Amino acid sequence: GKMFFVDLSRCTACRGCQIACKQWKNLPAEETRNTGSHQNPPDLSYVTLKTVRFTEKSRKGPGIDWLFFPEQCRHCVEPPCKGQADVDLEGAVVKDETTGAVLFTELTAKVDGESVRSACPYDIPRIDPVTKRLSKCDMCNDRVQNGLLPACVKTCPTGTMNFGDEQEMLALAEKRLAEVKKTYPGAVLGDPNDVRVVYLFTRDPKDFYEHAVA
Amino acid sequence: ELQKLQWAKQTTSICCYCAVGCGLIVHTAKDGQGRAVNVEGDPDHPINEGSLCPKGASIFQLGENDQRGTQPLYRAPFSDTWKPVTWDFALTEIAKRIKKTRDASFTEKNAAGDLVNRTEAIASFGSAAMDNEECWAYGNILRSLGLVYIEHQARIXHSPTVPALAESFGRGAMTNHWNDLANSDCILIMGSNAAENHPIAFKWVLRAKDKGATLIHVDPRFTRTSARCDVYAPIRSGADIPFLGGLIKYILDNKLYFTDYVREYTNASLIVGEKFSFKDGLFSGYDAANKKYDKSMWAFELDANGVPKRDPALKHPRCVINLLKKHYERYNLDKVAAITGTSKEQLQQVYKAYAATGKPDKAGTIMYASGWTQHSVGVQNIRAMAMIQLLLGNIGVAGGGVNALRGESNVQGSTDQGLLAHIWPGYNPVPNSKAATLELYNAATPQSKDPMSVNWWQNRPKYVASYLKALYPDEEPAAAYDYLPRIDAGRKLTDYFWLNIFEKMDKGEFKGLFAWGMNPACGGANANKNRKAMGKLEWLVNVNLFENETSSFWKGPGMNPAEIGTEVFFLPCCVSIEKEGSVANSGRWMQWRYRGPKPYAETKPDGDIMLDMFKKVRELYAKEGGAYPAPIAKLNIADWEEHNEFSPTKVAKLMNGYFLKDTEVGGKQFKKGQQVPSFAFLTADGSTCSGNWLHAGSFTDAGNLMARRDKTQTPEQARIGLFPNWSFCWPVNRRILYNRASVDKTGKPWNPAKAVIEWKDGKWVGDVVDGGGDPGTKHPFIMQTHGFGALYGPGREEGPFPEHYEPLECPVSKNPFSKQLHNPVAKAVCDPRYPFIGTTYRVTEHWQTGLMTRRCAWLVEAEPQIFCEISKELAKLRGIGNGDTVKVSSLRGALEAVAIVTERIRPFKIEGVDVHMVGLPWHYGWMVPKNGGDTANLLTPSAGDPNTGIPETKAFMVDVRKV
Ligand SMILES: Nc1nc2c(c(=O)[nH]1)N[C@H]1C(S)=C(S)[C@@H](COP(=O)(O)OP(=O)(O)OC[C@H]3O[C@@H](n4cnc5c(=O)[nH]c(N)nc54)[C@H](O)[C@@H]3O)O[C@H]1N2
Ligand SMILES: Nc1nc2c(c(=O)[nH]1)N[C@H]1C(S)=C(S)[C@@H](COP(=O)(O)OP(=O)(O)OC[C@H]3O[C@@H](n4cnc5c(=O)[nH]c(N)nc54)[C@H](O)[C@@H]3O)O[C@H]1N2
Ligand code: SF4
Ligand code: SF4
Ligand code: SF4
Ligand code: SF4
Ligand SMILES: [S]
Ligand SMILES: [W+6]
């Protein structure tokens, strides 16, 4: 299967990944206002599969801990969204066994939306208010199938975004975690046995987002 | 295959935003014949390796955009509506407005009776956004029409960089390049927010850290850059000289300077004349009356030949090095800590880390941009940093350099093409009224009696000749010389610059303005004055991608179109992906890009707009005559054209240059019509043309070197990321400038593990050597008269050593380093109703005035509205809650923004008083989007430093009140 290693110790919150996702799938933009934050859109939605979250945390001495979280579907090895969807209509949520992608199909219109969202321990699934279909990061599965990196991965300048075979990426996550601990001692991988999107947080993941880890 | 791309033609391009110069892949439908379907990174490009920040990443949405211009619009005097109009009409009526105004205002000879052959009724702004070939041809079109008021982007920011670095090293350009950052041991980011404003640079900054580098951000604010550096040090606005002066004192006091490098390669050993002195913050030869210096009091002592005398012992008390030690003794940590606001502990940490790069096996680099260049102290900030780099032997080495980060994609190129009032292409000065002949013009070039000083500028006559033989190939250079306009020898040079152009326009001394790929109505400091000033124009030609605040100033906030009589032609140009051509990035990489989709609707490349527009002036002058016809009729535009339209390939070949007849140069035979293989083989006798001597080598007989996409590297090249076969850089593919300084007297690298060049088997191996000659035979700074890195610069107006004079006029009353408080060479009101220091800056998501990015829904999505960033302390003092609407006001205007309250802004301790800084983006404008807000330049002062000609956009007094 495939995996993302996301090294948040390298993230400049450039939001190249946020725009790349929308360009590749030609998603529309949400109506946004500024309410006292660079963060926008403020939350994932039917038309936003990835948003960079910004949290400011105090530290001793000059500056702050600025925590950046490019949020997306974790593509769980055993996805709860599938089990909760299968209750209503098997086929609505599928697993591409070659890549590991957890993929919503057009049949999520038939299943219960709120149910499948509540079952997700990362609060990822988003429902179109009118059509009642569910959308989320699809791992850029067709790009991966055609031997290309996902849009958000290829676009990332810093080396935050990494993608490949789960063996090489777990090995990278391990090796990078040991190195990054030297400067950020509270550095941890997010649920590295359960998910195909393995975030390295520089501190307590909940500092980055309430649902950063299950 | 992927269905999205399946039947789309794949073409390469270069990003149309910042000067990193990231590679793109464009997919165009119907195998090239349709619209662009996809735009993303070029995985093979050696700078970005397929990565793009949100601006490059959204180029699809910029190109394929239904808000874009479709055809020329026209606005009639006192009208309130646009009128759709044909190209044939627009350029016929344009030509008539040019000729009328020209004839009426042409001065054959100035008041002193000297030949100038110029027009002072027409001005031109722009553009750093145009292709190099379009910039070159644009400049030549404006000068053939006799314009002298020719300015663009480059004046506002890096006008100080070029003089400061030219005085220091002999060239104004970024010394190293983006890939080279990864070789640095200590990266000092100061006056730069590079993670936001050159985002792909951080690929290479973070790779430096991977290999042991310390990353240091020195900034008044905590930014996205600060988040990913090892050291964040606050500094209060305009306290950079004290910071850098304290680092000079530290380096000298602690013998941390690289003695051999300093002895041989800097002017450390040169003896200053006895007439040089400094006391009470003033240099010798001060004229208190006029507020200016007698620079002859600073002149070196000269030996019998006229060569500056030297003590290689470095013992003579008038040695540059010993005067330097004396000058910077005053900059102790306690004083520097007190004025910067930076803790003594943090100053020591930073000084220790950076000064450690004095070791030959360590490289230190500085990354700065508009945080330095948009301050009145800019030129001395940069001088000081250049002096620190020379002391530490960091100039000419991999991981070293002064990385003056260029802004716009082709600001380097647009400067190189002479779209500034004071220069022709190739940094040959625009003649003044006293340069009555070519021979007199070439007399101004200073000579050196030193046999080891290459003094490459002595070749200027070959470049000026070849430049005149490109414009006028049938004429003798000496005759051709009279066709081009001249500035007044008497008048202050800055009178021809951006600042004064708006001053003059506001006196109604301009009939016409070319706003060519710029947004003055948002870009210019004091937007209220500038939008009113533009009314007093008769006509305005705006060339751009979209309708904007400039083209439509007449229907702007509190404007009555019926009262405003200005005539306005909006001509829509095509985006970067709809045309072929080259752009010169910050590292001087001249990169060739191709057309994907053909121009949208009836939009045209700028090349076609200006050429067609010129030809209509040219034909109209041939049927009607008028003022001094010669330069217009004779200008060689045949070389610019192929198949009835602008040819980037042919313009680029003319810019490189070719032999106008058989010639022997440097003992080699060259045929007629053949391409000049480098500027070394140009002549002053008319045998060669070259539009730009810097471009000689860029497009040879071997082919278009700017189009090379070849990652072939030797081990030594690959080890430091030279990529000498990817595109081409001026001069002659020297990737790291001053690289002779990276080796000793025998040609052995100071740092073999990161060798730039090495003397191997009677050859220089690695980078192209910056100056020909065997090891130890030449001084390494070949563009310098004397051949040395200048620690002591006797041509700088504010003195040969940078000295702290307070740029913040209002909240400061004490210079702790002298009796001289403010700049003794350069009237801010400091009205107590505006107690806070306003500052302007950018976000990753938006571009410049936002004309381009306020039309891209994904960037507006991310950053939809103007904001005002304030400390918790200011928020509390003024009763502002995060997300509250706030009124920001100054003497110049007022606007509303949303308040962003954050610990990323902190108050500054200035003389035991808390002073509050207020941050605003200048990306917004009344046109789009709805509820975006307007330009922060409603708030900024108009005037500024009269020496450099730059407004104070980085420190201006404001009030902020809840709504
Ligand atoms: N995203 C994006 N990138 C851009 C641009 C853009 O509009 N958007 N524009 C391009 C252009 S045209 C240019 S010239 C460059 C400019 O690039 P930068 O100079 O990086 O741009 P700014 O964001 O204006 O400010 C740089 C930093 O200077 C700091 N600063 C302000 N005053 C001082 C001071 O007195 N001392 C010090 N040490 N720091 C100070 C600010 O806090 C800020 O962090 O960016 C280019 N790249
Ligand atoms: N307060 C404040 N003011 C500032 C600054 C600041 O930091 N603070 N920054 C200053 C600086 S550093 C600069 S460079 C200036 C910039 O000021 P301007 O150059 O006026 O800024 P824009 O017009 O927004 O940006 C460049 C323009 O190029 C246009 N363009 C893009 N492609 C093409 C093309 O192919 N052809 C043509 N003809 N046009 C094209 C874009 O549409 C855009 O209008 O602003 C300055 N003003
Ligand atoms: S592209 Fe990379 S560096 Fe930029 S915000 Fe996304 S993950 Fe962070
Ligand atoms: S993997 Fe594809 S769908 Fe998922 S966030 Fe990245 S670009 Fe968007
Ligand atoms: S993160 Fe949520 S939506 Fe994505 S696979 Fe896991 S349970 Fe399903
Ligand atoms: S704006 Fe600059 S960093 Fe971003 S993609 Fe373009 S060239 Fe690269
Ligand atoms: S620029
Ligand atoms: W700029």
Author numbering:
A (entry chain B): 2 to 215
B (entry chain A): 36 to 861, 869 to 1005
Extract from the study:
Molybdenum- or tungsten-dependent formate dehydrogenases have emerged as significant catalysts for the chemical reduction of CO2 to formate, with biotechnological applications envisaged in climate-change mitigation. In the particular case of the tungsten FdhAB from Desulfovibrio vulgaris (DvFdhAB), a selenocysteine coordinates the tungsten ion and the enzyme displays a simple heterodimeric structure: a catalytic α subunit (harbouring the tungsten active site and one [4Fe–4S] centre) and a β subunit (with three [4Fe–4S] clusters) involved in electron transfer to/from electron acceptors/donors. In the active site, the Mo/W atom coordinates two dithiolenes from two molybdopterin guanine dinucleotides (MGDs), one terminal sulfido ligand (—SH/=S) and a (seleno)cysteine residue from the polypeptide chain in a distorted trigonal prismatic geometry. The allosteric mechanism involves large conformational changes, namely of the side chain of Met405, a residue located near the active site that is fully conserved in the subclass of Fdhs that contain the recently reported allo­steric redox switch for protection against oxygen-induced damage.
In this work, the M405S variant was engineered, which allowed the active-site geometry in the absence of methionine Sδ interactions with the metal site to be revealed and the role of Met405 in catalysis to be probed. The mutation of Met405 to serine (or alanine) led the Gln409 side chain to occupy the space left vacant by the absence of the Met405 side chain, resulting in a backbone rearrangement that pulls Thr408 4.3 Å away from its original position and causes it to interact with the protein backbone near U192. Additionally, the catalytically essential residue His193 displays a new conformation that is closer to that in the oxidized WT enzyme, but is intermediate between the oxidized and reduced states. Therefore, this new conformation, which is associated with increased backbone flexibility, is likely to interfere with the catalytic role of His193, possibly accounting for some of the loss of activity of the M405S variant. Met405 was previously assigned to play a key structural role, but only in the present M405S variant could we confirm the significant rearrangement of the Ile191–Thr196 helical region (particularly the mechanistically relevant residues U192 and His193) and the consequent distortion of the metal coordination geometry.
